[PDB]
Amino acid sequence: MSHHWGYGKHNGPEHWHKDFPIAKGERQSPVDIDTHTAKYDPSLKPLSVSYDQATSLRILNNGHAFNVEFDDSQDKAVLKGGPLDGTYRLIQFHFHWGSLDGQGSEHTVDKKKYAAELHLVHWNTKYGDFGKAVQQPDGLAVLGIFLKVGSAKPGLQKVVDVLDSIKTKGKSADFTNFDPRGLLPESLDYWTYPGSLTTPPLLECVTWIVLKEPISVSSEQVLKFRKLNFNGEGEPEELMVDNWRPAQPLKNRQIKASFK
Ligand SMILES: Cc1cc(=O)oc2cc(C(F)(F)S(N)(=O)=O)ccc12
Ligand SMILES: [Zn+2]
After folding, report:
1. Which residue puts its alpha carbon closest to atom 14 of ligand 1?
2. Which overall architecture, per CATH, does domain 13-257 show?
């Protein structure tokens, strides 16, 4: 209730370390993925994305981004395999995007920034609940998917059209029966490394799995994202753009590739 961090000039990523010292930690995210240095790991098991039974419930503008929330009271939508040991349950997805197509993603590929990045957040069921999971090194698994501007993503339109109803901070809307499988690219080839949440509290509890294949969304679709507001209703308009944290030092970590 007393957090004041954001993405503006005076409360942006370069200021976060004051209230959250872990911002300068040993396994912070996002990071630049240097494709020539990432090594193929033949030991990585196949990635398993089982979203057939996913049950979305609501979409919320939290003043930073918008979250599409799922019912995670049961083992429906889960992520397993890949670098993961155990079962991770989908709790929500959100995006990070820019003010222009040339920036917006958190992770970068050989320093290339994509227009946006989708994050599907999952928590390790061995810890019982999300709050307990974020206190563990292997508590979360976040699946990251890059977005580039070109052809429209049919599966994203239902999200785009509901944004008018959650323009400002604190607004939410019913959002049932949304199928996240419609946001995935064809290939599940990925890079993986141990990291953190990319907004405060910046906890170092995430196994990052970033897909190599980006999805394409249309200019009209991303333009709608850019019409959202960071501010609450009745306050001066601050367009919700550039809600991404820049790449952090890789330090003592190796990024592994699931493909050759
Ligand atoms: C506390 C928490 C709960 C949750 O369901 O999702 C989150 C997502 C993020 C993130 F958006 F910053 S990221 N990018 O690290 O996923 C940060 C914190 C949470
Ligand atoms: Zn995120």
Report:
1. 198
2. Roll (3.10)
Q: 140-149 and 66-70 as β-strands: parallel, antiparallel, unpaired?
A: unpaired
Q: Which ligand 1 atom minimizes the distance to the CA of 121?
A: 16
The position carrying tokens 């912070």 is: 28
Kindly provide the resolution of this structure in angstroms, with one decimal: 1.6
The alpha carbon dihedral of 164, 169, 172, 177 has a sign of: positive
Backbone angles phi, psi at 164, to 5 degrees: -60, -30
Judge whether 198 is annotated as a binding position: yes
Structure tokens at 115: 């227009």
What is the atom index within ligand 1 of the atom nearest the CA of 94? 11
Dihedral sign, CA of 133, 258, 71, 244?
positive
**Would you list the domain boundaries of the chain?**
13-257
Q: What is the dihedral of CA 226, 227, 231, 232, to 10 degrees?
A: -140
Distance CA(78)–CA(65), nearest Å, equals 23
Q: Which of 161, 156, 147 is nearest to 183 (CA)?
A: 156
Q: Is 71 exposed, middle or buried (0-12, 13-18, 19+ CB in 10 A)?
A: middle
Specify burial of residue 255 (Cβ count, 10 A radius: 0-12, 13-18, 19+).
buried
Q: How was this structure determined?
A: X-ray
Q: How far is CA 9 from the centre of its chain?
A: 22
Q: Would you name the residues annotated as active-site residues? A: 64
Task: Determine if residue 15 is labeled as part of a ligand binding site.
Answer: no
Report residues whose beta carbon is within 6 angstroms of any ligand 1 atom. 91-92, 94, 119, 121, 142, 197-199
Is residue 182 within 8 Å of residue 202, measured between CB atoms?
Answer: no
